[PDB]
Amino acid sequence: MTEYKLVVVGADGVGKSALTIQLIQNHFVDEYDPTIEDSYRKQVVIDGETCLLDILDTAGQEEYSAMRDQYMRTGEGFLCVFAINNTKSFEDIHHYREQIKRVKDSEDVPMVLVGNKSDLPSRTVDTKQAQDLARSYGIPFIETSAKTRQGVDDAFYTLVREIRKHKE
Ligand SMILES: CCN(c1nc(OC[C@@]23CCCN2C[C@H](F)C3)nc2c(F)c(-c3ccc(F)c4sc(N)c(C#N)c34)c(C(F)(F)F)cc12)[C@H]1CCN(C(=O)OC)C1
Ligand SMILES: Nc1nc2c(ncn2[C@@H]2O[C@H](COP(=O)(O)OP(=O)(O)NP(=O)(O)O)[C@@H](O)[C@H]2O)c(=O)[nH]1
Ligand SMILES: [Mg+2]
Ligand SMILES: [Mg+2]
Numbered sequence: 001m002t003e004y005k006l007v008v009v010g011a012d013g014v015g016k017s018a019l020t021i022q023l024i025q026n027h028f029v030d031e032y033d034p035t036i037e038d039s040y041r042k043q044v045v046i047d048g049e050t051c052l053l054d055i056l057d058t059a060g061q062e063e064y065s066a067m068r069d070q071y072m073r074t075g076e077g078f079l080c081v082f083a084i085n086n087t088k089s090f091e092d093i094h095h096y097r098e099q100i101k102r103v104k105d106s107e108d109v110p111m112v113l114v115g116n117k118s119d120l121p122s123r124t125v126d127t128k129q130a131q132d133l134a135r136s137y138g139i140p141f142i143e144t145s146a147k148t149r150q151g152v153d154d155a156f157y158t159l160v161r162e163i164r165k166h167k168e
Contacts, residue, residue, distance in 0.1 A: 001043070002051040004160050005074065009058050009096045010081035011089040015116040018146030019081065020057040023156055028147050035059060046157050053156065073103045077110030077159040082125065083117045084143070090115075090125045090133075097137060110162035111139045114155050119145040 008016040018029035024040040037059040043052050056075065080096050082089040093113065100109055113134040115125065127143070134141035140158055144151035 002049070003054055004051060004163055005054050005056070005076040006079065006156065006159055006163075007056045007058065007072065007075035007077070008079045008081060009100075010079075010114075011083075011086070011092050014081045014083040014086065014089050015144075015146045016059075016079075016081055017057050019079070019114070019116060019144060019152060019155070020055050022146045022149055022152050023053075024055065046160055051160070053160070055156075069103045072100070077112075077163045079112050079114050079155060079159060080139075081114045081116055082130075084115045084123045084125050084130075085117055085120050087124050090130070093133065108166075110159055110166055111137070112155055112159045112162075113137070113139050113141045114151075115141065115143045116146060118143045118150060119147050 021029050024042045040055045115130050130141050142151050142155040
């Protein structure tokens with residue numbers, strides 16, 4: 001069965017775990033879920049083909065050891081997540097993309113820009129800002145709510161379709 005190794009990255013508190021848990025377990029994150037780094041797995045059907053998603057929900061310390069670089073190099077595609085009410089999380093996106101490009105030694109890595117928490121009303125990053133940044137990188141922008149499930153499948157499946165083609 002075809003396996004896709006997806007990696008979810010972004011600032012503290014943006015909803016990396018919530019997006020992953022919603023995709024895999026069909027509900028929202030809570031006070032009992034893992035806050036150490038962990039991986040999830042689920043067999044799904046995308047465009048009529050069965051495949052297995054292996055999702056790395058990142059956590060822990062920021063560090064640039066050879067081991068950490070090499071480990072991240074193994075991810076096949078990245079969701080770069082910010083929260084639409086957290087401008088600093090959005091301004092950090094360039095940092096995550098820079099590290100992905102550095103370890104993959106390539107500008108052509110499957111990636112999706114995810115603006116999470118779209119259910120909130122108090123938005124401080126507007127859609128045009130996020131679209132502009134996504135267009136500057138040549139990556140899709142998908143607005144999500146891990147709480148209501150809006151956009152969640154589209155975000156992960158878009159990343160899969162990018163990897164699937166990139167492998168062909
Ligand atoms: C989980 C750890 N984490 C991470 N924080 C940061 O930066 C946090 C901020 C705020 C402080 C100063 N620093 C710089 C900037 F200002 C933003 N960068 C991270 C990062 F670049 C990666 C990464 C991604 C893709 C890759 F190819 C590689 S390769 C490699 N060696 C990586 C590393 N490390 C890495 C990862 C990883 F690996 F999990 F995906 C996690 C990162 C937490 C630390 C506390 N955090 C926070 O938001 O505090 C406010 C977030
Ligand atoms: N309103 C709203 N809150 C969300 C959403 N996703 C996550 N949150 C909230 O944001 C906080 C962090 O969510 P979590 O998924 O743990 O974020 P994380 O990016 O995994 N944080 P960490 O880097 O510490 O592991 C929690 O209070 C959670 O309820 C969302 O779509 N909508
Ligand atoms: Mg945290
Ligand atoms: Mg988390």
